[PDB]
Design a protein around this nucleic acid. Structure first.
Ligand code: MG
Ligand code: MG
Ligand code: MG
Ligand code: MG
Ligand code: MG
Ligand code: MG
Ligand code: MG
Ligand code: MG
Ligand code: MG
Ligand code: MG
Ligand code: MG
Length: 47
RNA sequence: UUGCACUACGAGUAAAGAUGCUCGUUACGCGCGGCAGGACGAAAAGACCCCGGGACCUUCACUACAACUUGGUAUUGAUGU
């Protein structure tokens, strides 16, 4: 899965851009803390 | 317990140890109290032995499995070297 990261994550990306992580990092650190969301419909909102 | 029954003995004979067959011998019929030699007495389809089956036990019999244990992979991520 691909996460659009709303927060700024060091050596991982800035606001808004989409970045793919190895699925444990995302669901155990990024989604719980609001750093990223899963990319389903957010591309239209960003663009 | 019981196939019967007016169920002797000897020497024989016979599935090789005979109340029941042979040849002899002995013995009136029926009870009662005793004895325990025989009726291969009774009792338990011999525990021995063998054959077939079983059971449980053992183990460096076989094949499995539990348990224990090994690594891979999922759960499972980040950063450096
Ligand atoms: Mg995964
Ligand atoms: Mg008599
Ligand atoms: Mg005789
Ligand atoms: Mg005789
Ligand atoms: Mg006769
Ligand atoms: Mg008598
Ligand atoms: Mg006797
Ligand atoms: Mg007997
Ligand atoms: Mg028998
Ligand atoms: Mg052993
Ligand atoms: Mg293991």
């Amino acid at each position: 899965m691909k996460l659009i990261l709303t927060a700024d994550v060091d050596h991982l990306g800035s606001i808004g851009d989409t970045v793919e992580v190895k699925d444990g990092y995302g669901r155990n650190f990024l989604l719980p803390r609001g750093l990223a969301i899963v990319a389903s419909r957010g591309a239209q909102k960003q663009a």
